Amino acid sequence: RRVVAHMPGDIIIGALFSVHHQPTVDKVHERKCGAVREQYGIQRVEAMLHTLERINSDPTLLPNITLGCEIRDSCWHSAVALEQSIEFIRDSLKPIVGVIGPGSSSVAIQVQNLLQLFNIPQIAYSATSMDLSDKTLFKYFMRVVPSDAQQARAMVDIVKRYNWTYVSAVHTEGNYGESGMEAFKDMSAKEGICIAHSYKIYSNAGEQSFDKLLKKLTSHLPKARVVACFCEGMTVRGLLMAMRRLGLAGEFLLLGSDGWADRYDVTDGYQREAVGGITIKLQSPDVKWFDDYYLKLRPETNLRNPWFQEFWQHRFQCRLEGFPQENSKYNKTCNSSLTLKTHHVQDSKMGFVINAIYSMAYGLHNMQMSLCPGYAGLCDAMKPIDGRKLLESLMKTAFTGVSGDTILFDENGDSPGRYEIMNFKEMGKDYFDYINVGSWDNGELKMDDDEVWSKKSNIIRSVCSEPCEKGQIKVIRKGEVSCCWTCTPCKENEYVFDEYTCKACQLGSWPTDDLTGCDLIPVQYLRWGDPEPIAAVVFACLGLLATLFVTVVFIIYRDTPVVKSSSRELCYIILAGICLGYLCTFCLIAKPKQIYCYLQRIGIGLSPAMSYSALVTKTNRIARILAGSKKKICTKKPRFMSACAQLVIAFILICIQLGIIVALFIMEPPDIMHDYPSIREVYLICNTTNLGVVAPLGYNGLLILACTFYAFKTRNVPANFNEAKYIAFAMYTTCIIWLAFVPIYFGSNYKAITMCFSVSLSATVLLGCMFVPKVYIILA
Amino acid sequence: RRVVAHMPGDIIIGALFSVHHQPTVDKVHERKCGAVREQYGIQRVEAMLHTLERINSDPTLLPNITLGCEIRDSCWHSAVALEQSIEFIRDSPIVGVIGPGSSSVAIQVQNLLQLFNIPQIAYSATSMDLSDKTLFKYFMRVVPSDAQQARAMVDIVKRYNWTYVSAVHTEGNYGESGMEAFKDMSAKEGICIAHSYKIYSNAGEQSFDKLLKKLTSHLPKARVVACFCEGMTVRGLLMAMRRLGLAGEFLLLGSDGWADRYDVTDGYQREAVGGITIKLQSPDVKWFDDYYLKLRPETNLRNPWFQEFWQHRFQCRLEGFPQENSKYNKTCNSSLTLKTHHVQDSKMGFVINAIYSMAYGLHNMQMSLCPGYAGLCDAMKPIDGRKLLESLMKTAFTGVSGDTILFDENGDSPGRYEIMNFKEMGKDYFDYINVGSWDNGELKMDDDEVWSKKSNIIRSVCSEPCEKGQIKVIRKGEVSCCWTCTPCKENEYVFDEYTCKACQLGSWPTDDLTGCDLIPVQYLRWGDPEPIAAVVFACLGLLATLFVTVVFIIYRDTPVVKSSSRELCYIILAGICLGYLCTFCLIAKPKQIYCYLQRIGIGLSPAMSYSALVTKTNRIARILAGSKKKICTKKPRFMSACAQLVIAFILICIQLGIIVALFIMEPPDIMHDYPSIREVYLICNTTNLGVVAPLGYNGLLILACTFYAFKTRNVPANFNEAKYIAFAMYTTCIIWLAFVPIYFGSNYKAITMCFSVSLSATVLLGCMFVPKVYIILA
Numbered sequence A: 001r002r003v004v005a006h007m008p009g010d011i012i013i014g015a016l017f018s019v020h021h022q023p024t025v026d027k028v029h030e031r032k033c034g035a036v037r038e039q040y041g042i043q044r045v046e047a048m049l050h051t052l053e054r055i056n057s058d059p060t061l062l063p064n065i066t067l068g069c070e071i072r073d074s075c076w077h078s079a080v081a082l083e084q085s086i087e088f089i090r091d092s093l094k095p096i097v098g099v100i101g102p103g104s105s106s107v108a109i110q111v112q113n114l115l116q117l118f119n120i121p122q123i124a125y126s127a128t129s130m131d132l133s134d135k136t137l138f139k140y141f142m143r144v145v146p147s148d149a150q151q152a153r154a155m156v157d158i159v160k161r162y163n164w165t166y167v168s169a170v171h172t173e174g175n176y177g178e179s180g181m182e183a184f185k186d187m188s189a190k191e192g193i194c195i196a197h198s199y200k201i202y203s204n205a206g207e208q209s210f211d212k213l214l215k216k217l218t219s220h221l222p223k224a225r226v227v228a229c230f231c232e233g234m235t236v237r238g239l240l241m242a243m244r245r246l247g248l249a250g251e252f253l254l255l256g257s258d259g260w261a262d263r264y265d266v267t268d269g270y271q272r273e274a275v276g277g278i279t280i281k282l283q284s285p286d287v288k289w290f291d292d293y294y295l296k297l298r299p300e301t302n303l304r305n306p307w308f309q310e311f312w313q314h315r316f317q318c319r320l321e322g323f324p325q326e327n328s329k330y331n332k333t334c335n336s337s338l339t340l341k342t343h344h345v346q347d348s349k350m351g352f353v354i355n356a357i358y359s360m361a362y363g364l365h366n367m368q369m370s371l372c373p374g375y376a377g378l379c380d381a382m383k384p385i386d387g388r389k390l391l392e393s394l395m396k397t398a399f400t401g402v403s404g405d406t407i408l409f410d411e412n413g414d415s416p417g418r419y420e421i422m423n424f425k426e427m428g429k430d431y432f433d434y435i436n437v438g439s440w441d442n443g444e445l446k447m448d449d450d451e452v453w454s455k456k457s458n459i460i461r462s463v464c465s466e467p468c469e470k471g472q473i474k475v476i477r478k479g480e481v482s483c484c485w486t487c488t489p490c491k492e493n494e495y496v497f498d499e500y501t502c503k504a505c506q507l508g509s510w511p512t513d514d515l516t517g518c519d520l521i522p523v524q525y526l527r528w529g530d531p532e533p534i535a536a537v538v539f540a541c542l543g544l545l546a547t548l549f550v551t552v553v554f555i556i557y558r559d560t561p562v563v564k565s566s567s568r569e570l571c572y573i574i575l576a577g578i579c580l581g582y583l584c585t586f587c588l589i590a591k592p593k594q595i596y597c598y599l600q601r602i603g604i605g606l607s608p609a610m611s612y613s614a615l616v617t618k619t620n621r622i623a624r625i626l627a628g629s630k631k632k633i634c635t636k637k638p639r640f641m642s643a644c645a646q647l648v649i650a651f652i653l654i655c656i657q658l659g660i661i662v663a664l665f666i667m668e669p670p671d672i673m674h675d676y677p678s679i680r681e682v683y684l685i686c687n688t689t690n691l692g693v694v695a696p697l698g699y700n701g702l703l704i705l706a707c708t709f710y711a712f713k714t715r716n717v718p719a720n721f722n723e724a725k726y727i728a729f730a731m732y733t734t735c736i737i738w739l740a741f742v743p744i745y746f747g748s749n750y751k752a753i754t755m756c757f758s759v760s761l762s763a764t765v766l767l768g769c770m771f772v773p774k775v776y777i778i779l780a
Numbered sequence B: 001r002r003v004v005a006h007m008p009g010d011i012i013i014g015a016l017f018s019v020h021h022q023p024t025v026d027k028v029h030e031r032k033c034g035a036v037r038e039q040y041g042i043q044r045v046e047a048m049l050h051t052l053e054r055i056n057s058d059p060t061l062l063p064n065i066t067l068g069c070e071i072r073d074s075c076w077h078s079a080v081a082l083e084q085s086i087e088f089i090r091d092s093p094i095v096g097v098i099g100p101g102s103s104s105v106a107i108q109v110q111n112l113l114q115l116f117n118i119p120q121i122a123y124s125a126t127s128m129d130l131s132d133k134t135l136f137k138y139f140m141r142v143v144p145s146d147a148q149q150a151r152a153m154v155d156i157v158k159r160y161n162w163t164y165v166s167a168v169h170t171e172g173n174y175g176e177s178g179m180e181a182f183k184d185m186s187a188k189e190g191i192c193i194a195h196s197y198k199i200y201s202n203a204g205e206q207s208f209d210k211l212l213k214k215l216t217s218h219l220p221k222a223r224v225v226a227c228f229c230e231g232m233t234v235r236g237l238l239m240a241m242r243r244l245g246l247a248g249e250f251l252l253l254g255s256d257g258w259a260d261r262y263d264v265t266d267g268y269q270r271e272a273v274g275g276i277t278i279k280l281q282s283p284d285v286k287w288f289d290d291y292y293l294k295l296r297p298e299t300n301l302r303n304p305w306f307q308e309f310w311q312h313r314f315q316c317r318l319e320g321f322p323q324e325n326s327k328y329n330k331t332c333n334s335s336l337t338l339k340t341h342h343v344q345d346s347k348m349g350f351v352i353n354a355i356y357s358m359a360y361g362l363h364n365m366q367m368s369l370c371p372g373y374a375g376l377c378d379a380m381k382p383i384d385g386r387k388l389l390e391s392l393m394k395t396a397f398t399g400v401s402g403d404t405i406l407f408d409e410n411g412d413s414p415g416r417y418e419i420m421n422f423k424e425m426g427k428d429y430f431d432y433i434n435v436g437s438w439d440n441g442e443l444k445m446d447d448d449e450v451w452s453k454k455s456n457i458i459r460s461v462c463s464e465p466c467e468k469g470q471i472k473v474i475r476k477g478e479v480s481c482c483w484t485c486t487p488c489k490e491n492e493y494v495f496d497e498y499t500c501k502a503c504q505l506g507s508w509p510t511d512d513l514t515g516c517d518l519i520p521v522q523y524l525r526w527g528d529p530e531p532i533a534a535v536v537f538a539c540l541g542l543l544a545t546l547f548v549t550v551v552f553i554i555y556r557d558t559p560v561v562k563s564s565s566r567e568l569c570y571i572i573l574a575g576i577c578l579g580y581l582c583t584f585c586l587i588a589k590p591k592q593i594y595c596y597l598q599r600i601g602i603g604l605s606p607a608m609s610y611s612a613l614v615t616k617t618n619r620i621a622r623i624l625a626g627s628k629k630k631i632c633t634k635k636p637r638f639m640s641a642c643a644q645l646v647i648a649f650i651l652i653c654i655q656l657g658i659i660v661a662l663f664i665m666e667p668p669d670i671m672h673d674y675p676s677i678r679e680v681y682l683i684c685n686t687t688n689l690g691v692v693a694p695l696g697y698n699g700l701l702i703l704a705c706t707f708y709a710f711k712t713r714n715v716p717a718n719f720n721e722a723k724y725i726a727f728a729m730y731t732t733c734i735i736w737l738a739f740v741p742i743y744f745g746s747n748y749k750a751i752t753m754c755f756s757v758s759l760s761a762t763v764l765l766g767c768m769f770v771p772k773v774y775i776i777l778a
């Protein structure tokens, strides 16, 4: 059958050490475990035996009690451990007070469901899953190693510290890996990370599984350099063997969780590729006295340990003819000169085994005096020993570990602990080692970043998209995970608000340089410069001087018959109208202000009114004089209107236009409004509407029609130096100009300026072609 | 400690069958169950014993080899799971084990089974999670999954349209999985589960009382209790029912466990009535009953509990045996047997059928391994149920109930339930009566036998439907169970049971709020109340105009009427007559031909019928223009002659131009106006802006002729025809102007327009034309 190591004693404590290897996938119903594991196996078994010798040899710790122990392998498998636990239970009814936990996590769960029923305590020295920390489904489980809830924090801390946010996660099958991922993935997706794709694999999978798993892990090759391997010991060995088989040459930075640890086993022989691997590991101080004891142990005196012979056969690949287990498959023989100090390595999680054994011993020590303090040993109270009373003693007991740190069990049945962020490098020529490169204690991630990455060119940040935050280029989500954001620019008026909002700045403002904020775009207008404004004001000045000259002539020459014959006051009216029309641009272009904003309307409307009204009335009177004299039969109506009625009718014809202007001014208050052709530019002009300008325009258009009709009715008339012979052309010109005005004004983009030119043309065509003629007549 | 009735044999097969009642609350750690299960334990142990002896004594099943057995009393629960595992873990011989009573009592056993490959067939477990073979590989059963039970429960609660239910349940894998399935597959369809109270089977009086008081909190709302209540839970709830003395005010509804059993209802004759109770179909086994009746305490000693079982059954004592139990005062005489008050347990045939299932699987393995030898050859020396379970996977054979046994992939024998109740046959003897049968999704109950009156139990309904015509249901914030039903808008029809939408302008929702409809418009046509006198007025105006036209054209030769003009008068006649034409053309159903005709009329009619008057007044003023001054006035020509016709035509062309312009702007078409949500009509596209322009031009052309006629007023004309034309024309203008209020002041903006046109016509005729007729009369 299967060999079982035992230690005689009144009280026997169980133990499940992964003495052999995990049974090969080929066939497990035969329960054929694989090879013998040294570090996880024989060292742990000898630790058990030797520490039990120390305990039962210690007078102060469990006096007069020889704690025997039954040691059973477990081959690190769901299968063999269950059968061994069954053999524990069948003999429970010599009794077995408690067992020392199995190696992995899933095996711990499976043994725990069995052993919680029968009040048999268990102490696991390596199981590191959250699910076992629950005290409802696994109410009766205890361990001396902190949960992985304090390890997923370590990984999130590392992956945050080095800016990575796009990584690929491989977790070994079983409860340990699945729980570890369901911790790390959630805890990083919450904080700052987005996992590429969380794979899975079996520890003992075939070479094809790794040969394809490397293909998936290189699928994201230029974006996933951080293999978040939450993996057991053998799985990382599998990926490394795959790297060697396929030829990956260090293109990865592994992150080995716990099962990798500083264990040389996983990478020995082929440690040429794991370089850069950042591997967490529980803080396990070394033990020296046991190390010397084990080193000086030889097969000749080792009989209480049954696996020692084949272990000696394995490590030194030879034969021991002095023992029945000759292992004839080997050719060479083993000599006594060989000693264990040659290439000796001590497993990482070794002090935890002794810590667990000490915890069990101290629980028994507490329970002894919890009932019969006087008696030294197993009194009548504990003859039917009850694990119920031992459970609370374990809950409350707190010894001092061999390393030194005090051990306490919380309500969850675990113990606090720290970590150690080791790392793998290349020191010598073909010589590699696990340098301590940091530490971890309740979030205080300390890492000697200087020791590794001897340059500043560290590993690629492994982010899907570079920090695309340059300038106005903004990041937007691709409709998927935030690893690969879609990065796009914003438009000229579209201002990046905080980090991604491509909002558009308001119509009045402009997004400033470097997309820092919105600035109100400076306004532009016509102050005094530019070619056309100064040209128009010079035009106005010339017209003003000419008009002043003509008015002076006709006021200092009011007696001569060449001009006194025509209505002197009507000429005075037209002169004043032309003067104000010229003056309109003198205030139309200066600067748009509240005060001038209505003077502009005053000019543009009022001026043409009397500029043409006196002309219309004069031409109507002339027509009536001539048309009535065409027949001249009687025509005995000397007065008609005549007299001074011309001045009053001009007053009233001014008054109507004044009223129209007042009505517009009241209905449309004069004030400056900001205008803009496009968003690129902003202007400022008066608030006069599309209706404001044209409100007094018809009153003058019809008046122009009336005067041109009466000029037609006169046309060629023998008068005082034939004024009408030029007034006709003047009216033709003013008609065509005022007709061409509307198309030019509407849709001009230069509405404010063309008013002055239109008024200037209307003024000059009238003045020159109806007043100037008589001026050189004054010369004669 | 626990006593075991060991039966030796060549092949010993294990099993897990309860004997006494469930463990007491304070005796859990003592590992000692309490009172005796009279109808369960002895029945099941005698069942295994008798079927085993009949199987081994029959060469047709496992020939030349005897069959042994070994069990450990479990008393239900996982409390004695310690003892069942103590027996189990023996192993390596074990070739067969049979699943214990409760599902959770067997699930961990199955988990352990999956490791070292021992077969196990259940008979009372029902949980669906056990049907999964991924993690429960070596588990089997001869009863179906609880999914069928849940489906049956949903079917029962929905057939009698119970919706708002208050659902207690038991605990373990039965209650939790059963309630998850029942809730998921019930509340989806129509069911309103109030809550799912949880309670252990052996609970105390206080917990049962508080649970009952929570259940009695919805008395007019949920009068059923959708128990997954186990037998013990029903026991306790009925204890509470009696101690409080509930009047059965809510109708119980048990589950798989509670069954027809007299086990827990007794003493409470009138209470728990109406207990619809799903029970598993199993005919009573024949050869078990007589063999059980043959058992006597002195004759049979191999069964340990059997000796004191008589003292437990009959209130007496056995002096002749060490199991005295002196607590009983009376003594047992030689006049007692098991025939009196006998009851056979319902869940009986499943045990025997499962035992036969495993025996036939073992026989199949026996033939398959070494056909040469019938018995135990060298092949069975390596005891291994791994191949045995694979052999029995496909095994099929007839069951003792006349049916067969087949193990599907899920490993449950197909079956069916019964839906049977509790009623009141006669005074002081109240008995259940099998009143239904459910089968694989095909349902059937004798709804008549249940509720053998008109009165039923109050429907498990939170609120009445209250869908009377329009009152529409709506939620409150809780689950879709209780509705504050409310009617929608009068113009809104119920889109569905909880949605409404307003009808379009065409109409309002029809009767019963079934949907929407279309109102038959309605409009103004020939007939009607008001137009009774309208075309009468129009025809009287026609009579007047025809009379005046015939008298004028018959007296046209005399220059009496030729004093001023001839063509202008004819234009007046034409205009007034066509205005009457307008008032005919209106007040009808508007169509495409009518639409533009309306515009043409109410446009050019007053236009020309007043423009001719304008020109005539112009002519008379021009005649009297020079009379006042008469200085020379040697311009008698001007235009005159026939140029008055030209001036009239050029004057009237503007109105036609504007009319055609608005005709282009507004095409002649008929639209459905909406004066009110209730009613609609049909009318042209004419608007205020459409009508005001021709009316404006006609005002422009009426003002001038008013002014010119007033300038004329009293003149020495032919009989001074101008005396009355202006006198009535002032009224003409005042009525035309004062019309705008009435037109834009009521919904009658066609009949008023017609009356306006008719009046504005008749006033011109009666003044400008009536006197001249009397003139040419004499």
Ligand SMILES: *[C@@H]1O[C@H](CO)[C@@H](O)[C@H](O)[C@H]1NC(C)=O
Pocket: A160, A161, A162, A163
């Ligand atoms: C990356 O992480 C390190 C850690 O301090 C630090 O440089 C910084 O916070 C992150 N960003 C860059 C650009 O380094």
Ligand SMILES: *[C@@H]1O[C@H](CO)[C@@H](O)[C@H](O)[C@H]1NC(C)=O
Pocket: B159, B160, B161, B456
């Ligand atoms: C609903 O319940 C009433 C109550 O008497 C019953 O008559 C009817 O058959 C049930 N089913 C339907 C579909 O109405």
Ligand SMILES: N[C@@H](Cn1oc(=O)[nH]c1=O)C(=O)O
Pocket: A103, A104, A105, A106, A126, A127, A128, A129, A176, A231, A232, A233, A234, A258, A259, A260, A349
């Ligand atoms: N990480 C594992 C333990 N463990 O896995 C290995 O591969 N070695 C080792 O110690 C767990 O805590 O479940």
Ligand SMILES: N[C@@H](Cn1oc(=O)[nH]c1=O)C(=O)O
Pocket: B101, B124, B125, B126, B170, B174, B175, B178, B227, B228, B229, B230, B231, B255, B256, B257, B258
């Ligand atoms: N009550 C259980 C079923 N059940 O009750 C028993 O007593 N045995 C049994 O299988 C349920 O509601 O599902």
